[PDB]
Structure formats: structure tokens, C-alpha cells
Nucleic acid binder design. Structure first.
Ligand SMILES: [Mg+2]
Ligand SMILES: [Zn+2]
Ligand SMILES: [Zn+2]
Ligand SMILES: [Zn+2]
Lengths: 113, 57, 49, 45, 67, 48, 56, 263, 147, 61
RNA sequence: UGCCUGGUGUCUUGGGUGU
């Protein structure tokens, strides 16, 4: 009766932006990123990738409520680095890691086929 | 049984068909989630809304 | 023939064990609707005192 | 005008809102309506 | 009522193994050995075939309502 | 007088493509159609 | 649908209908009457369609 | 830097070991394979006649759970993203089932082999119900006796397991790391001795047990992950793994594009 | 506090899913020598004080047919009772109310599929119908379970 | 059709009725009732005929 | 130009649910 539609977990409304960024003025060089229609799958990947960068001093995320499909991430880098550049570097690095993983799996599967 | 059995909360609209409570307030209500039901009453005036938010909160 | 028929049918239908015009002071609840929610519930209902 | 099915011999027939409620061939007193001709669709969930 | 298509817990397809399970039990194999022969390792899957009650064989005994 | 009221309809676009329903409310440009597939009623534009 | 009606005997009287000669060229025959024949139950349309009415 | 080593390979399950990756990446890959790889499943049932003892929506639910071959589902489009009025051949696959029992004795079983593909995308290997062999009858759908008939027309669409569990290609993904508990990520409940009261992991022989005089290593991180991917037959194990990787890459690329277009 | 967490994927695969049936009864009452109730699809013209639901799902005999999806407040049994006509015969072109509606609506909070319609005669020889409605109830937040 | 006409047609088809499972069960029940009535009347001659008829009609599968 | 409807017994009794 009051159950929401299941496609609302991943289908993005037109008026809702996928990615909203607002600065966090309490500490220097910090931003708050709000991801819509995402969950732990992308969030944990990004967080653990960014935690290893020497120029990222704080990274965290939280899912406010399990019944709503979104999460909010806090990122805070050194003085030299803008946080959005660090986020882009994390995305590209994980993409390269996945690409080489796929290549190696294909090689191994062909060998053992 | 006592006056803490009627308290005024702030509405948050949520999906699905059950009332939802922070678990700390289950003690004054003597309530648990094994099938209990609770009543909700809506004030219909500015005066009554102020009374609820300033006295029974 | 209507006397016995109506008396028995009324007492079994309503559960008041007595004449229709003496419904007060009669033992009520003798006859109940069989509980058919599940097999065990029916078996329990048929062996109740 | 509307089809019906007997409750014992499963014989199809029809009634005109004036015939007695009865199966024509076995005389059963209980009959059932037939399924609608509309489209029935389910979400398979 | 009738053997479920998928195991509830994990999702393995167990709906195609009811007839084979009955055939194996017919030959005298034990229930554990029959379930092992069908390659049902996880006990979540084993409970699906082990505890299924086949009620459709009782519903089919009633005369069909149409002809 | 809303000739499409109480008529079987099919949805051709959106998240309910190809679902059979019956029109219930026909105020204007926003039709309320009950779905046969789940037990619910949804708004939908006339173009859909 | 109508052979068991009491009036069907007079209804079918004098009617013209297509008949399978069998010996097939279909031809028309004139109904001189009807005669119920006990023990001559026959399948009319299906197996369950037993009929005792006969057309002369 | 990442490495993959395959232990066992089959059409339906692959057992492999990942190494030199973070735990988060392996877990995200597992989650993606479980609930974000698109497959093909029956999503609409039009029941033209159903005189069986099962309810119409009972049979519809059973049909939705039948796995269909989804090899070329990438070329296929989502139903909500197809501009065609109603359903075309490029966003849906139409299957038809017709079952009947002849004779006045016996019982007829309706299997998933009776589902016949009527229309679908041109030359795409999608829609056919999965069969173990050429002589496998398939999933039991219903049973019929005399004068009971089932005549339905089903439409299959593309979706993911987030929307409904019937679109999940995997059954259960076993996942495991650190068999000998050198990282002390878990604390073992015991009554007398924790070592002899707990069964050894099935991969315990793949890693050297810690030495009796060894001290705890606080600089170590989980490095080798053992995971087994089982599928329902709609997709092969290698296809599931590769498509999970590709889906994760697409998600990250979408995030990157959003960031770059935000400015 | 006695709650529990259930697996959504198990619910999707049919765990604890159930079937719900509800039956409705109605019969034609006899009030006099020639005052009888009738099963019919009432019209907005010849009847007065109609229910606010919809009568478009009724057949010619005033009974819904099996396989039809119904919602709350829909009319599943159409019945009318005669009423002595007024002076509307003055200038009404046969469009004067002679019958009053006594239809049976579906319960407001319930909906489903009409499963089976039964038509027969009571002990008194009058018409007598039973309509059975079917729906499926899937577990959701708030449903009660027990070991 | 009238009620009497329906009864006449039903009786005619019953005369034409070779066999029907519902009707066979009804006939067997009526025979059992007649047999108990004969038993309560201590009629040792009728009961033998009714038993023979019941044996002939029965033996279902 | 053919033009849209809100109005729902009562009294007993029984069986249940949460404290
Ligand atoms: Mg409680
Ligand atoms: Zn009949
Ligand atoms: Zn399982
Ligand atoms: Zn299309």
C-alpha cells in the first residue's frame, strides 16, 4: 500500500542531480558530496581508495537511512590539492585497477579453458 | 497510566505502513514492536499547535 | 413440526441454550463458529471444554 | 446472454434472467459464472 | 504446494530436481545421499527439497470445474 | 463528458510500459489509472 | 439444444434441412414426424450427447 | 599490480583467488555480481486461459523466476528507455506456453521446456529458457489432469536484481579471506581451547600457519581473497565476472563524467 | 524490541507469501405478494440514491464475472428494490425513479481479483449469489511472525 | 422453461443417463440408506438383494 | 452538443489482539 516502487533505488528523477557538492566551511579545503541513487557499493570503494592518498587527510561516508537510496561523503585534502581533483584521481585509479583485473582474468580463463 | 504516555512528536513522512519511534521512547510508552499499536492525534489550530510544541514535547 | 425444528436451529445457531423467549438467564456460548484458520486450530476447537 | 457452468457435470449453458436457476441436463441447483473475456495481465513478481 | 523454483536463501534453482529426487529415493538411496547426488551442498538448499510437502497431488484429485 | 472513463487502457511510455489498466479519474491532462498487475492506482499524462 | 422440448416434435414437423445421404451428396428431406426409440441412445455431438429422439 | 588465479573453472561456477587488491574492491565486485549485472527475465504474463488448480498469480510468480539465456543482453535496451510505442523486438522477448492433458486418466506435467520463443531481437542469443542438457525437461511449472488447460503469453524484459531477485544471475557467492586469522579480524568464542574447537577453513592449506614464536603484525592488511561465483545458468561464470567488472567501471565512469560536467 | 530483519530477496523468491480469499453473500428478499428484489445493473435514470462507486464492471444480470480486477468501493453485486412511483409521471419520458439501489460494494480497504461467482436458489426459491475475491499478500514491514 | 418442464427433462435424461460419477455416488448412498432401513426392519430377504446390487455397482478405481 | 451520484441500521453475543 505504502511500499515504494523498486526502480526508485536506481532510477534517477530528472529534477534530482546525481551529484551535489557543497563546501564545508568549518575546516579548510573540505567539501561535502551527496550521491543520489547509490549505496555502499560505490561509497566503500571510493572511500578505501581515497584513504590511501597521502594528500587526503579526511574521508568518510554515511548512509542516513536504509530506506532511502543515497549517501553523503565528506572529503578534506591538503592545502595544495583541491578535493575534487582527488576524487577524480580516485575514480580514474579504480577504473585502471578494474581494467587490468579484467585483462588478467581473461588471460587466466583462456589458459585454463 | 501516566502523563508520559501522551507526548508530542515531530512528523517525518516515510514509506511503508507503520509508525516509527526512536527506541529510547519505548520506555515511557511501555511499548515494544511485537504488535503494539499507538494512536496519533493532529492539532487543528495555531493555539493548539503551540500548546503541543511548548508543553507536551 | 415447527416447534422442535425452530428451537433446535435457534439454539445451535445463536449458542443460547434454551427457549428463544427466555434468552436472558440462559447459558450462552455453548455453540460457536468452528475455527478454520488452520488444521491445528480446528482440531483444538473440537476438543475444548 | 451470459454463460454459466454447472457445479456437478460442468456443462456450459446460458440463461435469460427468467429461467429457473438449474442445470439443463442434470438438474443441479448450483451453477457458476464463466470467466470474463477481458485481458488479464500479471506482473510476474 | 509445488516445489519452489528457487531456493529462498541463496537462489539456486531447485525446481528441476524434484523428479530426480523422487527417482533416487525410489531406488533405495538415503535422503542425504540423494541430496548429495543432486549436488546440493549448502544446507539452505537441502532444506528446500528435504522439507517440501507436495500438496498439488491432493488438489488434483478433485474433479475439474470445467470441461 | 470524458469518453475514456471506465475504459481499458494500455501504457506505452515511462516506467509502466505495456501494462493494462482502467481509467478512473479524468479531470484533465492527468489520468488516474488503476493497474491490473499490482493492486494500486497511479497518475499518468494523457499522452502516455 | 432443443430436441427435448415437448413442442419440438411439432416444431420439427414439416421442416427442410440438409441431410447426409451416406450411400456423399447432401440432400433435403421432409419431416413426416418423429418417434422416440428406447434403447437406441446414440452420440449426438460428443460422447456425452446421448439422444433417444428420432426423426422420420 | 592486481592478480587473478583460477582454481576451478566450469560453465556454472568458477573458484578464483584475487590478490593485491583492497578488501573494499573485492566486496564491491561481489555486491555488483550479486545485484547489478543485467539479465533477462519474464516480467509480464498475459493469461488467456488457466483452468489448473494453481492461482493465476501463483503461476505468474513461478514463471518470473525461470532463468532465461541472457548472453547478448548488452545489445538489448531497457523497457523505459525505448521510444517505441508498446513493446518492440528491441526491448522485449515474447515467449508462449500452451499445455493440455488429453485422455481421461493420468496427470500431465508442464515443464519450462514448453516455453517457446515467438519473437525477439534479430540474431541475438537471448530469450530461450536455460536447459542443462538437450534432454533436460527443465523446471516443473504446473500439473494438469483431464480437461485442464494452460495457455499464456509471457514477455521478458531486461533488469537488475536490485529491482527484483528474479534478475539475479548469481545464486551464492562464497567469499573468504585470511583463513588462519593472522590479522585478528575475528575473536574466537571457545569453552576450553579455541584452536581445537573451530573447524579449519577449506583454504587453510593455501597459507602458512603462524609460527608459535611469531609476534602480532600490526602493519598487515588483507591481501588474498578466495571467492566462488555460482550462476543460475542464464550467464556463464566468466561472463558474470567480466560483466560485473564492466558494470563497476561504467558506474565509476558515470561519476567521473558528472564531476567533470559539474564545473 | 522484538523486531526482526527479513531478507528482501527471500521475500522476492516467495518466502512466507500467502493467498487471501474473501466471500460476499447476497440474496433477493421477498417483502410481499409481488414486492421482490432483483439482481440487475441499475441505471442512473430509473434508480435513485446510487452508491458512489462504479457500476461498469457488472454484467447484464447484475453480477461481476470472475477474472475481473476490482478495487475498493466497486460494486460487485447489483441489486434494486422497488419503490412506489411519485408524481413524476407528470412529464417525465419514462425516466422516473421506480427502484432504489441496494447494491453490495467491495470493502473500501480491500482489492483483488474476482475468483469465483456462485449463483443458486435459497430455501425459499429466491435467487442467491456468493462472490469470492482473491488477492496475494506479500510480507512487509509490520507483519507479525512467530516461532 | 418452467420448473415442471425442467424436472421432466431431467427425468428423461436420467432415463437416458448411462452413467455419471456424481449420480453413481448418489445412487450408492440411496442404496445404503435403503439397506439400513431394511436392516432395522429385520428383512433378511431384501437386504441380500440390496447387498448384491451394491456389490455390482461398486468396485471403483 | 449529449453531459456525473456521495448516503448508511441497531441491539445482543462470541472469538480474538496489546498491556
Ligand atoms: Mg508487546
Ligand atoms: Zn449439470
Ligand atoms: Zn540455497
Ligand atoms: Zn522497444
Amino acid at each position: 500500500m505504502n511500499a515504494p516502487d523498486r526502480f526508485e533505488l536506481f532510477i534517477l528523477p530528472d529534477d534530482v542531480p546525481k551529484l551535489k557538492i557543497t563546501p564545508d566551511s568549518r575546516v579548510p579545503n573540505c567539501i561535502i558530496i551527496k550521491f543520489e541513487r547509490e549505496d555502499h557499493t560505490l561509497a566503500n570503494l571510493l572511500r578505501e581508495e581515497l584513504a590511501l592518498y597521502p594528500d587526503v587527510t579526511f574521508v568518510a561516508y554515511k548512509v542516513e537511512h536504509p530506506l532511502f537510496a543515497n549517501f553523503v561523503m565528506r572529503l578534506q585534502t591538503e592545502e595544495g590539492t583541491r578535493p575534487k581533483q582527488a576524487l577524480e584521481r580516485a575514480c580514474a585509479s579504480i577504473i585502471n585497477k578494474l581494467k587490468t583485473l579484467d585483462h588478467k582474468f581473461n588471460e587466466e580463463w583462456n589458459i585454463k579453458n | 497510566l501516566h502523563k508520559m504516555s501522551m507526548m508530542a512528536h515531530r512528523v517525518k513522512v516515510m514509506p511503508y505502513s507503520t509508525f516509527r519511534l526512536n527506541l529510547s521512547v519505548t520506555s515511557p510508552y511501555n511499548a515494544d514492536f511485537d504488535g503494539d499499536e499507538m494512536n496519533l492525534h493532529v492539532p487543528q489550530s495555531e493555539e493548539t499547535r503551540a500548546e503541543l510544541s511548548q508543553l507536551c514535547a | 413440526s415447527t416447534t422442535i425444528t425452530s428451537g433446535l436451529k435457534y439454539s445451535l445457531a445463536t449458542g443460547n441454550w434454551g427457549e428463544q423467549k427466555k434468552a436472558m438467564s440462559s447459558r450462552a456460548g455453548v455453540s460457536q463458529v468452528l475455527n478454520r484458520y488452520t488444521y491445528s486450530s480446528t482440531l483444538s476447537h473440537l476438543r475444548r471444554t | 446472454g451470459v454463460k454459466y457452468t454447472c457445479g456437478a457435470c460442468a456443462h456450459n449453458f446460458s440463461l435469460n434472467k427468467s429461467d429457473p436457476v438449474r442445470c439443463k441436463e442434470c438438474g443441479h441447483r448450483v451453477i457458476y459464472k464463466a470467466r470474463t473475456k477481458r485481458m488479464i495481465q500479471f506482473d510476474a513478481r | 504446494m509445488i516445489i519452489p523454483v528457487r531456493c529462498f536463501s541463496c537462489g539456486k534453482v531447485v525446481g528441476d530436481k524434484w523428479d530426480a529426487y523422487l527417482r533416487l529415493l525410489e531406488e533405495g538411496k538415503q535422503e542425504g545421499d540423494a541430496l548429495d547426488e543432486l549436488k546440493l551442498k549448502r544446507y539452505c538448499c537441502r532444506r528446500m527439497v528435504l522439507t517440501h510437502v507436495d500438496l498439488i497431488e491432493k488438489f488434483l484429485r478433485y474433479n475439474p470445474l470445467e470441461k | 463528458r470524458d469518453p475514456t472513463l471506465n475504459k481499458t487502457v494500455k501504457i506505452r511510455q515511462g516506467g509502466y510500459k505495456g501494462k493494462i489498466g482502467i481509467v478512473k479519474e479524468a479531470n484533465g491532462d492527468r489520468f488516474r489509472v488503476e493497474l491490473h498487475n499490482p493492486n494500486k492506482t497511479i497518475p499518468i499524462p494523457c499522452s502516455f | 439444444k432443443y430436441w427435448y422440448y415437448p413442442e419440438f416434435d411439432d416444431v420439427v414437423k414439416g421442416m427442410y434441412l440438409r441431410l447426409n445421404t451416406g450411400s456423399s451428396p447432401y440432400k433435403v428431406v421432409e419431416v413426416l414426424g418423429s418417434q422416440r426409440i428406447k434403447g437406441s441412445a446414440y452420440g449426438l455431438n460428443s460422447k456425452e450427447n446421448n439422444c433417444d429422439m428420432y426423426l422420420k | 599490480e592486481p592478480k587473478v588465479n583460477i582454481i576451478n573453472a566450469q560453465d556454472d561456477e568458477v573458484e578464483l583467488m584475487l590478490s593485491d587488491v583492497n578488501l573494499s574492491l573485492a566486496n564491491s565486485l561481489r555486491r555488483t555480481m550479486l545485484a547489478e549485472v543485467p539479465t533477462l527475465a519474464i516480467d509480464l504474463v498475459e493469461i488467456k486461459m488457466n483452468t489448473s488448480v494453481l492461482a493465476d498469480e501463483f503461476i505468474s510468480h513461478r514463471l518470473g523466476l525461470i532463468p532465461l539465456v541472457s548472453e547478448d543482453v548488452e545489445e538489448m535496451k531497457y523497457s523505459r528507455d525505448c521510444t517505441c510505442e508498446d513493446y518492440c523486438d528491441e526491448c522485449s522477448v515474447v515467449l508462449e506456453l500452451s499445455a493440455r492433458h488429453e485422455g481421461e486418466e493420468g496427470t500431465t506435467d508442464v515443464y519450462s521446456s514448453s516455453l517457446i520463443k515467438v519473437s525477439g531481437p534479430g540474431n541475438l542469443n537471448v530469450g530461450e529458457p536455460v536447459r542443462r542438457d538437450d534432454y533436460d525437461q527443465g523446471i516443473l511449472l504446473c500439473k494438469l489432469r483431464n480437461h485442464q488447460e494452460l495457455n499464456i503469453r509471457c514477455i521478458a524484459k531486461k533488469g537488475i536484481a536490485k529491482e527484483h531477485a528474479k534478475w539475479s544471475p548469481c545464486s551464492a557467492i562464497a567469499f573468504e579471506y585470511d583463513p588462519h586469522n593472522k590479522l585478528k579480524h575475528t575473536d574466537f568464542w571457545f569453552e576450553v581451547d579455541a584452536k581445537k574447537e573451530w573447524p579449519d577453513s577449506k583454504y587453510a592449506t593455501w597459507e602458512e600457519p603462524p609460527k608459535p614464536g611469531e609476534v602480532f603484525d600490526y602493519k598487515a592488511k588483507p591481501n588474498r581473497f578466495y571467492m566462488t561465483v555460482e550462476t543460475t545458468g542464464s550467464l556463464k561464470a566468466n561472463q558474470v565476472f567480466s560483466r560485473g567488472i564492466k558494470t563497476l567501471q561504467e558506474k565509476l565512469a558515470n561519476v567521473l563524467f558528472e564531476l567533470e560536467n559539474s564545473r | 524490541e522484538d523486531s526482526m530483519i527479513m531478507n528482501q530477496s527471500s521475500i522476492d523468491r516467495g518466502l512466507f507469501r500467502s493467498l487471501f480469499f474473501r466471500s460476499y453473500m447476497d440474496q433477493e428478499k421477498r417483502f410481499g405478494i409481488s414486492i421482490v428484489e432483483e439482481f440487475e445493473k441499475p441505471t442512473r435514470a430509473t434508480t435513485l440514491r446510487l452508491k458512489h462507486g462504479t457500476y461498469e464492471k457488472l454484467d447484464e444480470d447484475g453480477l461481476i464475472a470472475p477474472g475481473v480486477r476490482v478495487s475498493g468501493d466497486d460494486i460487485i453485486i447489483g441489486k434494486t428494490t422497488p419503490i412506489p412511483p411519485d408524481t413524476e409521471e407528470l412529464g417525465q419520458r419514462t425516466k422516473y425513479h421506480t427502484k432504489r439501489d441496494a447494491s453490495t460494494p467491495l470493502r473500501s480497504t480491500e482489492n483483488g481479483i474476482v475468483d469465483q461467482v456462485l449463483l443458486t436458489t435459497n430455501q425459499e426459491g429466491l435467487k442467491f449469489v456468493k462472490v469470492r475475491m482473491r488477492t496475494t499478500k506479500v510480507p512487509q514491514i509490520g507483519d507479525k511472525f512467530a516461532s | 422453461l418452467s420448473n415442471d418442464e425442467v424436472n421432466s427433462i431431467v427425468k428423461m435424461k436420467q432415463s437416458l443417463s448411462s452413467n455419471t460419477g456424481f449420480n453413481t455416488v448418489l445412487k450408492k448412498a440411496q442404496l445404503q440408506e435403503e439397506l439400513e432401513e431394511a436392516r432395522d426392519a429385520h428383512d433378511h430377504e431384501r437386504v441380500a438383494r440390496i447387498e448384491a446390487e451394491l456389490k455390482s455397482i461398486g468396485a471403483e478405481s
